[PDB]
């Protein structure tokens, strides 16, 4: 396992995206937390023990809180100030909609539910 | 923090366990025959309401 | 200062693992489980403390001789006069079998004389039915009646009077002290005395002492159960009484036993005391005796780590490492596992998570190979 | 003010006071959940808390469980072992990965 | 004190694991609330570690029925020496259920097995009730036992949402039609089946308000 | 006669090898009946040194009627109180 | 009884009170600068709500 | 171990019955007040440490004349970029209130950046209504603005700039780091706000002290007010955020002084350092130096007891039983009453209780004289 980088963590591999919103988790104080960095864990955003068996460098961050509350725990395993959420998901999302593939499959999903709007609204004719 | 925070209360027990004398002192009875052990004041008022076990 | 040493422990060797013919140990000792000598020396007095089931003719005897053989200057017994009274009447009995068929004849000796106000008549009604419930959960026969003073205390009355010695009567278990006591206590009513005493034996452990303390009662007898009451087992019973109903507990046991040792100490006429008294005040009694003679039995500390062999497991850690490097170094290759033996808490046998022992800060931390075959040289030695 | 130390397995690194930790947490718990049992019982790494057939009780070994885990900053598995001494408070502890 | 009520502490975090649950912690005090969980843990362990030494005297015992039964060899071979009594496992019962990899066989199954019973309570039992002429009440009886066979919700309801398949002018014929079909007073269907006398809920073309008609009987 | 695994194989005398020097074969030595293990839980932990048996006891199998139906009156007596309370309620 | 009664704690307090070196010890800070003064452990959990004064 | 010696303290001298021209201390003091000095022997470093309320230009001259002495080897200073940038486009002000009339302008140092998730929605509104709050109860004027940084900063910051001296920005009071901590706090609403901080001042001393320093901030102003800072007003100050709001001013104060400390101790370039913050997190951040370095300075244990005239209060008794025992041979009498002064505490003068030293336990017991002439002999000497 790594320590935590106040800030300055760069995951060593490209980490599984495991989602794109933080999750809101209570954590207590003085409990040592082992947050996954791989992205694959079964645990949730805890590790689980996938990273032993997934070809990855990225290394369980084990880290404590001094202070227990509710805090954002980073899904997308690319947080700067990880293990801890910096809004780094939304740039992720925002990148996958500038990439060429990524446009079209979201503006696909996009039109697709337009067209569920589209029969809804042409429903009386 | 990069340091698995502790607080200073569990330092500092840390530190007083690291003697070799060590013991539990907050006990009602001498049950490690300490010669040093002092009776600690017992936390029961004149009505006793709390004595029931 | 206060001298808080164990008092009322009922717990036999808790650092054994007994079982089989390993017991914990032997409850069976009729004369030293009933028999205490204590000292003062700054009065230069003794005092032959006897704790006293009354159901038993072989420590009655036993007693009778020991106070023909140390001629005490003072006995003190607990009964009352009424009951003295009635003893002394009855005549020609020799044995606790045939006194037993006298028990009855001498419950009278709990007069519990109160007058017939409305506030004393509600404390009788409650008390009369929470000594019924009492009584109940006690559940004890005719030939064990630990409360009822009988053969033994009757030689010591009649040995003393032979020999002209003075008799000092401490009263029954319940006397009017104690009832006075009692009737200051408000907590007391059959029902909460039923909900507690069912409710008392919260563990298994409790639930298999009871067990075992009942069972071997009825199978011994009374005679013989009081032959083999031991000191374990009769703070467990006080214990016992204590989950029954603390409040009355407290009266019966604590104050009485500080009211008995406050008389056989400040008010003892001679140097030579022969006290006969119910057994499960022996250890109060003793205790007090004990603190405020400052003749406690030296005891040495023990340190809570003292028995923990440290030396033994940072050896075995030792030798696994040495170990896991050989055979590393030997195939070319790391440990599977840093486990020294395999257990199956951790789920490592069948599971992604494994145990390994490599832990370090940064490229430039001197533990990096801490824990790894690379940390020992060509002749397996560390670095 | 004194900062915590950098290194992570210290109660693996000093068994010592890992030991002193249980018996401290255990004794207070027995004492604070049957005190008629241990008020008058020292607490040793070799103690155990079984009667002396060897049957255990599972109400004292779940109340041990909580202390050590409340004390320690962990979850015990209960279903995978029982703490019926002070040894095996121990080994559970040790084998944990993450205690502080 | 404080409009906190979403986000509410605890000294500890297994006196409630919830926002919901620490509210109520809070609300009834942690000690009441940690003795309860203690407590919960305890009877929990107590039934397990019963049930374990149960299934280790079964497995030791009779080692067929514990195979039979599905439980794991209870010994452990940590030592090294294999038990002599180790047998295959027999996964049946633990994986093909609602909780396991059949889960959804299981549901399928439960469902199956409900409407049957539905089917057998509704059909089957009542049908030995009467077998032979009724002197008293004859016609009341087989009325009553026939009742609950004959107005099953399967083939009665769907009226009320008619619109999903019955076009506007659709609607108003289909709504003549089952008005004449249902005209017999003595329907329990009848009865139990949604009104036609009401207006297609997309566009009315015929009526222009309900009840306002020429016939009792004819919706026109 | 053994009850534990490892110490019925640690020291075997009685082996096939050396009982065809004698060439006897009795009943009674069947490896069947040979060893049996008790019937309560024993589980391996690590100990200091080296892995330790703990033995896992919950409940004794000889209780009687009379200690059964002395335990069970409380729950006979809250029945009848219960009962009793619903029809004076 | 004839001898006003007092209790073993408050006559082990007396009895220590007449030491010359006595000072209060269930303090959380060193008023008093004695040489071996022991931080009490802190009596506040990690929801902190009995902090507020 | 826990070096727990005061720290917030604000109670001047409370052994002395200060009042009219006797007073208890001297607030005013405008270098020893803001400047302290702190030295770790075994790293051989130096700190400068300054506590700036930012509304003093003799302040802010007298610590960039400490800044151009010293050449400190690295400088720390309690603001942000953002600060910094605008500060640096002000030029050419060299006057403190100049400087204040451009505070809104330096008030857009305070981003707090956040997204507009429902959640931050909440929080947002939430922090602004209980910061509005608290600015009500603070009700500091536009010349005060402690947590605005100002000219001594901006000296400290051009200072540096100018010999080429590493700096270090700690962020405004309120940067990114706290008011994370404070979301992750949940306990901020500001009708509860309201209620507590008029529900605060629980004592009349509570209600004096605060009278006293906002009339005192009101009469001198900003300027003169900073200068006259003393530790003690400082503490108070302190501990009236902590009952304003504990729950926030553990935030605000203590653990942003923790975090000032970690900074300055483990992570300051070189041996010399010259911080500049905010005065109320001065008295933490040197607790922590000092119980780190070990170089608290040695104070005396004092005895509770220890200012006690025993010997002269026995002496009076003494004294006046001899008067009364020779007064009361003179005058072949007994003492009227024992006390030596009359006081009407006891209604002795005018009830029957009276005040009579007479006490012993029999006939036979040898202090039935005491407190009585017959005690004495003709001498006037005790027997
Ligand atoms: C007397 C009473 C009688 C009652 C009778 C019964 C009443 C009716 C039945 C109610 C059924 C409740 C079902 C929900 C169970 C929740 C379980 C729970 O509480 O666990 C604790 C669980 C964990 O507890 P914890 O460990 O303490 O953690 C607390 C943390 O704060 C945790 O915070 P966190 O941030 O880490 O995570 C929370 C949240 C954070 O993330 C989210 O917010 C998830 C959703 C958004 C994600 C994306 C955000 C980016 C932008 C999205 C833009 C598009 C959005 C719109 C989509 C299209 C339009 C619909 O993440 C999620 O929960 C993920 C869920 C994603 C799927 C949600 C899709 C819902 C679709 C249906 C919408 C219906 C709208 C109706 C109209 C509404 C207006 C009038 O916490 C929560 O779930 C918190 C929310 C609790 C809600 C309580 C129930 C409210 C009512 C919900 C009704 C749902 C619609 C109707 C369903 C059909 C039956 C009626
Ligand atoms: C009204 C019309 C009739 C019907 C209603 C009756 C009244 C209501 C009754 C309601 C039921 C609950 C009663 C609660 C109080 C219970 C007190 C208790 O148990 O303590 C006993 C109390 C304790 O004595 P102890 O501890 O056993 O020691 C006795 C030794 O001799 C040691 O003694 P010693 O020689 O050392 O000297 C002490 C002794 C000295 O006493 C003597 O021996 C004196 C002998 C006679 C010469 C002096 C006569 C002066 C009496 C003047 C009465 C003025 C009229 C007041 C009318 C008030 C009611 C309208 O005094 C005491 O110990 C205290 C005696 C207190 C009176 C006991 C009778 C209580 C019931 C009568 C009503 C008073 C309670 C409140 C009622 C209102 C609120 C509900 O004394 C007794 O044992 C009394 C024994 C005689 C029982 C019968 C009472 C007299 C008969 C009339 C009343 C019943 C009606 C009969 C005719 C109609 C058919 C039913
Ligand atoms: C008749 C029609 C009724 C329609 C409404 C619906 C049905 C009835 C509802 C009845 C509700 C009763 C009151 C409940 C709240 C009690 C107090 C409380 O704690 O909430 C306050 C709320 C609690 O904050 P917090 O718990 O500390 O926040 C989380 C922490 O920061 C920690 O953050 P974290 O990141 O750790 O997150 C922890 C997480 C962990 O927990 C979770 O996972 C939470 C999961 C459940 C979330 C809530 C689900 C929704 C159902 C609950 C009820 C709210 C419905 C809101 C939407 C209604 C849409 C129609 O929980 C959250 O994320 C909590 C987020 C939700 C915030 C609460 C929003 C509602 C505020 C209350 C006002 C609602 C008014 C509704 C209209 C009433 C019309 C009569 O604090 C405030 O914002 C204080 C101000 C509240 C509004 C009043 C002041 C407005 C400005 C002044 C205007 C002038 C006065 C006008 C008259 C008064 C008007 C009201
Ligand atoms: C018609 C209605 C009215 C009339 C009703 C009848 C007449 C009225 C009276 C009825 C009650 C009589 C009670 C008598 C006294 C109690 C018993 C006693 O003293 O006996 C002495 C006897 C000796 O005990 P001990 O050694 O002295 O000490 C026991 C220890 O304390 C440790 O033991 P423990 O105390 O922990 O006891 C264990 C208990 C613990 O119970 C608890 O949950 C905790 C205790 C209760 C806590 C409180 C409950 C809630 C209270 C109310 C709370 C609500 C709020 C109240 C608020 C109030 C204020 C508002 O949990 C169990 O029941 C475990 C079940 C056994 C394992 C299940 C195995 C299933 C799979 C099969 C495996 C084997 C297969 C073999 C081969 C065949 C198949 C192929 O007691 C026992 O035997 C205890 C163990 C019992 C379980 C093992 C034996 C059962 C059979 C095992 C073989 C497999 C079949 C399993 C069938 C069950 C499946 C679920
Ligand atoms: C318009 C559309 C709607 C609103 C949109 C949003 C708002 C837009 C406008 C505002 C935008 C900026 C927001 C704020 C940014 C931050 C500003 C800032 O830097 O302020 C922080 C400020 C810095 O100032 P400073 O350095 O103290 O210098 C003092 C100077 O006086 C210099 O003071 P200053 O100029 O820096 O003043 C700061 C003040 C600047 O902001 C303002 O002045 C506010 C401007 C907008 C509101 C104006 C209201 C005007 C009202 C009168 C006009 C008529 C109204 C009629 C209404 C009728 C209908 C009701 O900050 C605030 O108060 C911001 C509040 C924003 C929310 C506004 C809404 C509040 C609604 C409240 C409703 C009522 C309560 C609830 C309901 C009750 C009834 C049920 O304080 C802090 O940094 C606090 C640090 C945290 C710890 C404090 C501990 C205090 C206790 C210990 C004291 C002793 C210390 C130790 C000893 C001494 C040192 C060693
Ligand atoms: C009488 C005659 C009347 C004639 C009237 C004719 C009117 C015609 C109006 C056409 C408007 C088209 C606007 C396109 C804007 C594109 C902007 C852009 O480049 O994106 C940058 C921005 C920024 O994106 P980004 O930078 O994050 O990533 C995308 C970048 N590229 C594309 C280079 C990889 O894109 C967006 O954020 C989305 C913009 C809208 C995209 C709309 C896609 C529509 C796809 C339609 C598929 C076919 C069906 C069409 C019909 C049905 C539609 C519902
Ligand atoms: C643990 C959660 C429990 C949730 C509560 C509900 C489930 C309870 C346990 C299962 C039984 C459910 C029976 C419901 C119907 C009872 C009445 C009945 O049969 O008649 C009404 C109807 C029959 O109505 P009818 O047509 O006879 O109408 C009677 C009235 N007249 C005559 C006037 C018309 O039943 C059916 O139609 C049964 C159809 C078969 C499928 C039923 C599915 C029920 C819902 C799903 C249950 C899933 C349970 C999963 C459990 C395990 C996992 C958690
Ligand atoms: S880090 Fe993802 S499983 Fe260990
Ligand atoms: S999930 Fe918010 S930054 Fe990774």
């Known amino acids: 396992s790594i320590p935590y980088q106040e800030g300055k963590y760069r995951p060593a591999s490209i980490p599984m995206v495991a989602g794109f919103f933080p999750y809101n988790c209570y954590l207590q104080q003085g409990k040592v937390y082992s947050w996954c960095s791989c992205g694959i864990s079964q645990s949730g955003p805890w590790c689980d023990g996938l990273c032993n068996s997934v070809v990855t460098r990225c290394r369980p961050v084990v880290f404590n809180v001094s202070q227990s509350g509710y805090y954002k725990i980073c899904n997308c395993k690319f947080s700067a100030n990880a293990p801890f959420c910096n809004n780094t998901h939304r740039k992720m999302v925002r990148y996958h909609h500038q990439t060429h593939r990524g446009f079209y499959e979201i503006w696909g999903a996009a039109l697709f539910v337009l067209g569920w709007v589209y029969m809804g609204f042409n429903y009386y004719t | ?53 | 200062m206060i001298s808080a040493r164990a008092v009322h422990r009922f717990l036999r060797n808790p650092n054994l693992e007994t079982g089989a013919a390993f017991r914990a140990g032997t409850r069976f000792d009729p004369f030293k489980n009933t028999l205490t000598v204590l000292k003062d020396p700054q009065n230069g007095r003794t005092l032959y403390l006897i704790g006293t089931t009354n159901s038993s003719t072989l420590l009655a005897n036993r007693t009778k001789d020991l106070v023909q053989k140390e001629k005490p200057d003072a006995v003190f017994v607990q009964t009352n006069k009424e009951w003295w009274n009635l003893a002394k009447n009855i005549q020609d009995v020799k044995c606790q079998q045939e006194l037993n068929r006298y028990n009855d004849l001498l419950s009278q000796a709990y007069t519990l004389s109160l007058d017939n106000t409305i506030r004393n008549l509600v404390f009788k009604a409650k008390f009369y039915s929470w000594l019924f419930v009492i009584n109940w959960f006690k559940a004890f026969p005719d030939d064990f009646h630990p409360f009822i003073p009988g053969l033994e205390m009757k030689f010591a009355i009649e040995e003393a009077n032979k020999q002209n010695i003075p008799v000092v009567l401490g009263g029954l278990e319940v006397d009017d002290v104690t009832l006075s006591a009692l009737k200051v206590e408000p907590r007391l009513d059959p029902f909460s005395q039923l909900y507690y005493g069912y409710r008392a034996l919260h563990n298994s452990f409790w639930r298999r002492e009871h067990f075992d303390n009942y069972a071997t009662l009825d199978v011994v007898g009374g005679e013989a159960y009081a032959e083999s009451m031991d000191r374990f087992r009769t703070n467990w019973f006080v214990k016992y009484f204590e989950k029954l109903a603390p409040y009355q507990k407290k009266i019966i046991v604590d104050q009485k036993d500080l009211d008995l040792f406050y008389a056989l100490y400040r008010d003892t006429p001679g140097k030579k005391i022969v006290a006969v008294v119910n057994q499960w005040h022996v250890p109060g009694i003793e205790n007090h005796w004990k603190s405020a003679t400052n003749t406690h039995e030296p005891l040495k500390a023990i340190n809570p780590i003292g028995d923990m062999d440290i030396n033994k497991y940072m050896e075995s850690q030792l030798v696994n490492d040495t170990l896991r490097a050989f055979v590393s170094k030997v195939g070319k290759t790391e440990p599977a596992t840093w486990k020294n033996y395999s257990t199956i808490y951790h789920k490592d046998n069948y599971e992604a998570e494994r145990v390994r022992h490599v832990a370090f800060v940064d490229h430039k931390d001197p533990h990096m190979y801490h824990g790894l075959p690379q940390d020992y040289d060509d002749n397996i030695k560390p670095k | 003010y004194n900062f915590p130390e950098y290194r992570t397995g210290g109660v693996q690194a000093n068994p010592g006071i890992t030991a002193k930790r249980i018996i401290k947490c255990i004794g207070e718990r027995l004492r604070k959940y049957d005190p008629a049992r241990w008020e008058n019982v020292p607490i040793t790494f070799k103690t155990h808390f079984r009667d002396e057939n060897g049957y255990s009780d599972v109400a004292t070994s779940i109340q041990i469980h909580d202390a050590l885990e409340r004390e320690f900053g962990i979850d015990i598995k209960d279903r995978l072992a029982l703490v019926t001494d002070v040894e095996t408070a121990f080994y559970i502890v040790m084998s944990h990965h993450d205690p502080l | 004190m404080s409009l906190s009520l979403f986000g509410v502490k605890n000294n500890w975090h297994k006196n409630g694991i919830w926002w919901f649950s620490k509210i109520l912690n809070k609300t009834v005090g942690e000690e009441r609330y940690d003795a309860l969980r203690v407590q919960r843990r305890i009877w929990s362990m107590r039934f397990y570690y019963a049930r374990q030494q149960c299934l280790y005297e079964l497995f030791v015992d009779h080692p067929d029925l514990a195979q039979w039964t599905g439980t794991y060899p209870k010994v452990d071979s940590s030592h090294g020496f294999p038990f002599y009594s180790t047998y295959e496992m027999y996964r049946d019962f633990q994986e093909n259920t609602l909780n396991s990899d059949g889960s959804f066989a299981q549901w399928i199954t439960l469902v199956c097995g409900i409407y049957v019973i539905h089917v057998i309570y509704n059909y089957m039992i009542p049908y030995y009730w009467v077998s032979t002429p009724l002197k008293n009440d004859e016609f009341t009886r087989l009325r009553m036992k026939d009742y609950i066979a004959s107005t099953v919700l399967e083939e009665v309801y769907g009226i009320s949402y008619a619109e999903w398949g019955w076009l506007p002018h659709d609607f108003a014929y289909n709504r003549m039609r089952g008005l004449a079909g249902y005209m017999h007073p003595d329907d329990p269907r009848a009865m139990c089946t949604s009104t036609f006398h009401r207006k297609h809920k997309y566009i009315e073309h015929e009526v222009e308000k309900v009840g306002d008609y020429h016939h009792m009987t004819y919706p026109k | 006669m053994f009850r534990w695994l490892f110490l019925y194989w640690y020291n075997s005398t009685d082996t096939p090898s050396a009982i065809a020097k004698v060439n006897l074969w009795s009943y009674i030595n069947l490896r069947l009946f040979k060893a049996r293990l008790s019937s309560s839980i024993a589980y391996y932990i690590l100990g200091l040194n080296n892995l330790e048996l703990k033995k896992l006891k919950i409940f004794y199998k000889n209780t009687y009627f009379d200690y059964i139906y002395l335990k069970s009156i409380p729950c006979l007596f809250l029945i009848i109180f219960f009962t009793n309370l619903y029809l004076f309620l």
């Open chain 2, 1 to 53: 923090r990069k340091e698995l925070w502790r607080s200073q209360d569990a330092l500092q027990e840390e530190e007083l366990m690291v003697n070799e004398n060590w013991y539990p002192k907050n006990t009602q009875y001498n049950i490690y025959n300490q010669p040093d052990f002092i009776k600690p004041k017992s936390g029961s008022g004149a009505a006793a309401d709390d004595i029931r076990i």
